[PDB]
Amino acid sequence: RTHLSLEEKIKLMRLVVRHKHELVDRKTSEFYAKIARIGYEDEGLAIHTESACRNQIISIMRVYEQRLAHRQPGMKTTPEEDELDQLCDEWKARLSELQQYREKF
């Protein structure tokens, strides 16, 4: 139930995207455990359980969708916002890929 800083959210999403091809459909536990471990060991995140790590990512993505939906033409963005948006877009695409695979075949 902790709150990540923007910096920590970017560090976490960098890891999620770097390791995105390691997520196996219906084996989420192993993936979010690994992300929590590497985030702690390398990026100085606090110790998170698997569930707490997964919830942080769910929350980042939920806020991302809000930001996307409320984006206005001509708005100013920061480089950190741009990076997080790009990382979230890439993670969303991975999740959608796995969904499509499960549904279609």
Author numbering: 29 to 133
What is written in the article reporting this PDB entry?
However, it has also been shown to bind Ter1 sites at the rDNA repeats where it stalls replication fork progression. Here we present the crystal structure of the Sap1 DNA binding domain which allows us to model Sap1 bound to DNA in its proposed replication fork stalling orientation based on structural homology searches and biochemical data. The overall structure of the Sap1 DNA binding domain (DBD) reveals a bundle of four helices, with helices α1-α3 making up a single myb-type helix-turn-helix (HTH) domain. In our crystal structure we have identified a dimerization interface between Sap1 monomers that we predict to be engaged in the direct repeat binding mode.
Since molecular replacement was not an option due to lack of sequence homologs, we attempted to solve the structure by anomalous diffraction using selenomethionine labeling. Unexpectedly however, the structure solution was greatly facilitated by anomalous scattering originating from an arsenic adduct (dimethylarsinoyl) to Cys81, formed due to the cacodylate buffer used in the crystallization solution used in the PACT screen (25% w/v PEG 1500, 0.1 M PCTP pH 7.0 (propionic acid, cacodylate and bis-tris propane)). For comparison we also collected native data from crystals grown in 25% w/v PEG 1500 and 0.1 M SPG buffer pH 7.0 (succinic acid, sodium phosphate monobasic monohydrate, glycine). The two resulting structures were virtually identical, showing that the arsenic adduct did not induce structural changes in Sap1. The packing between the α1, α2 and α3 helix bundle is imperfect and forms a deep cavity. Cys81 is one of the residues lining this cavity and the arsenic adduct previously described occupies the cavity without disturbing the fold of the Sap1 DBD. The structure was solved using a serendipitous arsenic adduct (dimethylarsenate) that bound to residue Cys81. This adduct did not alter the structure and shows that there is a cavity inside the Sap1 protein that can accommodate an organic molecule. The cavity’s connection to the solvent is too narrow in our structure to let pass a water molecule. However, the fact that cacodylic acid, which reacts normally with solvent-accessible cysteines, is found inside the cavity indicates that the pocket may be accessible from the solvent at least temporarily. We speculate that the cavity in Sap1 might play a role in a similar mechanism in S. pombe.
